[PDB]
Nucleic acid binder design. Structure first.
Ligand SMILES: Nc1ccn([C@H]2C[C@H](O)[C@@H](COP(=O)(O)OP(=O)(O)OP(=O)(O)O)O2)c(=O)n1
Ligand SMILES: [Mg+2]
Ligand SMILES: [Mn+2]
Length: 580
DNA sequence: GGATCAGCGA
DNA sequence: ACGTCGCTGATCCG
């Protein structure tokens, strides 16, 4: 039923009040330099709809905006903030974000628009976004009066949902988690995205050059070794032209056939010199398309920068997400892939990249929550549990543990505390089930207080229906009561990982809050560029490095006081690769 | 277009 | 039965 609003053809005084619901509509999925299709304003004085072309020229409207004393209630404020940034317009004053509010109250709700968020509060006087602009090869902006009626309903929806959403947060002890943590971070992530990272494009290209070379040269050998013309990309083909054309053993099977995962071609290599050229050719493939081109595809022409979008209310545990491109999955494990980081450089001349980590954080975080005597005492002794477990998964001595090695021991360590079964472990470090099984018993012999944790957090979820993080981020687990054994089991493994994965994500979020607050009150040219789950990557002039090497680690270790010490590793250099 | 698959990261 | 949490490129298939 037509909600009455005045389609404004000019701005006015009564629509620039010190509190209003705002909507700077960015239909485009990727808001980087995306046009603004419309504006809407609800405030005690009424409901208005301003046309972008208009309002974004009006200095009185542009002022009310950039004015932090003029309050704005919104949904996905970063989406608008970044879009405006690219227009030279500053957006301050956002005191409430409906999107992040619904995320804290229940990340499983999967809110992708105001309607979905509103529905969560028995408010449905608003249409879902997909209904208004559609999707697929049809997607478009409805005509003036349709776009208008919707933007005003979304704004009106935001106007009314603030109270309901804030109260439940208040009762859930998440009001501060919203206002003092999630909302502050949204402005910082906007800067990081708008700032973007510089891309050594010339190099990156001269990389794709040779790749194609070492590709076909490893593609024909494949047709040779196989003796035909199958496409290395069809697992169905890799299955037949393998175990059924080329007769090899099946050590594992998929829900369609038999695994051709790398953890198989590996074990099934010596049975033919084709399984080796497939391992290498697939690596060069991935690294070729999913990166060289994949990155250059998002590199803007002028600034030569890429601008990731840090999705803040997407993951179910509190972690951030990155897309177009995913800068949280840049190669680093092997040497070939790692060099691509030499393509990531400082944004200004004579600057440096400063990357800071967090030493075995989830393990430290588990130590604090689980409170196992020996896991804490160990850290209080400053040991590297990854290297140690490596000393076993290889029986070697501390001095004989390699970077490559510490990785598997690391994956084993988390595999073990987060559910892993003797079979899962057995296939990982490629051993027997009886060995893996006993290695896990001794693990919990080393950390009994932790065993007790895997057992009570399962009961905790079973009783409350939700797990929680250090900073009060909660995760509902209704499948914990499932009568299906595997639904219940996945639920239980979530109750074991979410509190830990989530608390670690809360801490890197708070550290980020202290880091911007510090860099600002000390006024430095340095700023954050990326967040990689438990690592921050800043860029600054060479002259600030000496102050960074102390301020960046100190801020991160201070964020929260655990029963164990936090510890940061940090390095810097001319490129992302150099920063080590 | 979607459903698996592949491979990369934390 | 199944460690957790993500994103992107490639090809099978109506
Ligand atoms: N196989 C993995 C790898 C990582 N993580 C989680 C736990 C780690 O603590 C966190 C950060 O990833 P890192 O690679 O930084 O691992 P740590 O931080 O634990 O090790 P490092 O001492 O190298 O920082 O991500 C996990 O659950 N399972
Ligand atoms: Mg890391
Ligand atoms: Mn780390």
């Amino acid at each position: 039923a037509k909600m009455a609003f005045t389609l404004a053809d000019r701005v006015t005084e009564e629509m620039l009040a010190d509190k209003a619901a705002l909507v700077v509509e960015v239909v485009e999925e990727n808001y980087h330099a995306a046009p603004i299709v419309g504006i809407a304003v609800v405030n005690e004085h009424g409901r208005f709809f301003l046309r972008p072309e208009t309002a974004l020229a009006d200095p009185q409207f542009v002022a009310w905006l950039g004015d932090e004393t003029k309050k704005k209630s919104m949904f996905d404020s970063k989406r608008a903030a970044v879009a405006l940034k690219w227009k030279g317009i500053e957006l301050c004053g956002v005191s409430f974000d409906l999107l992040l509010a619904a995320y804290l109250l229940d990340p499983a709700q999967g809110v992708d628009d105001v309607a979905a968020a509103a529905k969560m509060k028995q408010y449905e006087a608003v249409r879902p976004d997909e209904a208004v602009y559609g999707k697929g090869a049809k997607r478009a902006v409805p005509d003036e009066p349709v776009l208008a009626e919707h933007l005003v309903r979304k704004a009106a929806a935001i106007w009314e949902l603030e109270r309901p959403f804030l109260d439940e947060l208040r009762r859930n002890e998440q009001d501060r988690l919203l206002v003092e943590l999630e909302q502050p971070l949204s402005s910082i992530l906007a800067e990081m995205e708008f700032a973007g990272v510089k891309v050594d494009t010339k190099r990156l290209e001269q990389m794709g050059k040779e790749l194609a070379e070492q590709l076909g040269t490893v593609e024909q050998r494949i047709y040779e070794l196989a003796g035909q013309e199958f496409n290395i990309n069809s697992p169905k083909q890799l299955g037949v032209i393998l175990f059924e054309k080329l007769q090899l053993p099946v050590l594992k099977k998929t829900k369609t056939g038999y695994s051709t995962s790398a953890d198989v071609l590996e074990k099934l290599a010596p049975y033919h010199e084709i399984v080796e050229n497939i391992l290498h050719y697939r690596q060069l493939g991935k690294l070729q398309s999913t990166y060289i081109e994949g990155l250059l595809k998002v590199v803007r022409p002028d600034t030569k920068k890429v601008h990731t979008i840090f999705n803040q209310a997407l993951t179910q545990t509190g972690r951030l997400s990155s897309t177009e491109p995913n800068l949280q999955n840049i190669p680093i494990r092997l040497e070939e892939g790692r060099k691509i980081r030499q393509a990531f450089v400082p944004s200004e001349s004579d600057w440096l990249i400063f990357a800071a980590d967090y030493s075995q954080i989830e393990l430290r975080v588990l130590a604090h929550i689980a409170e196992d005597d020996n896991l804490m005492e160990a850290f209080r002794r400053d040991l590297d549990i990854h290297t140690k477990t490596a000393m076993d998964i290889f029986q070697v001595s501390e001095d004989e543990v390699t970077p490559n090695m510490r990785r598997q021991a690391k994956a084993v360590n988390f595999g073990i505390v987060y559910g892993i079964s003797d079979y899962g472990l057995a296939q990982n470090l490629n051993i027997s089930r009886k060995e893996a099984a006993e290695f896990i018993e001794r693990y919990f012999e080393s950390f009994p207080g932790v065993k007790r944790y895997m057992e009570n957090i399962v009961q905790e979820a079973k009783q409350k229906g939700y797990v929680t993080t250090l900073l009060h981020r909660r995760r509902y687990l209704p499948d914990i009561t499932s009568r299906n054994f595997n639904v219940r089991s996945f639920a239980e493994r979530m109750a074991m990982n979410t509190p830990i994965q989530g608390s670690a994500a809360d801490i890197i979020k708070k550290a980020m809050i202290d880091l911007n607050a510090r860099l600002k009150e000390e006024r430095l040219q340095a700023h954050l560029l990326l967040q990689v789950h438990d690592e921050l990557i800043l860029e600054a002039p060479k002259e600030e490095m000496e102050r960074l090497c102390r301020l960046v680690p100190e801020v991160m270790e201070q964020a929260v006081t655990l029963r164990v010490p936090l510890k940061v590793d940090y390095h810097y250099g001319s490129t992302w690769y150099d920063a080590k």
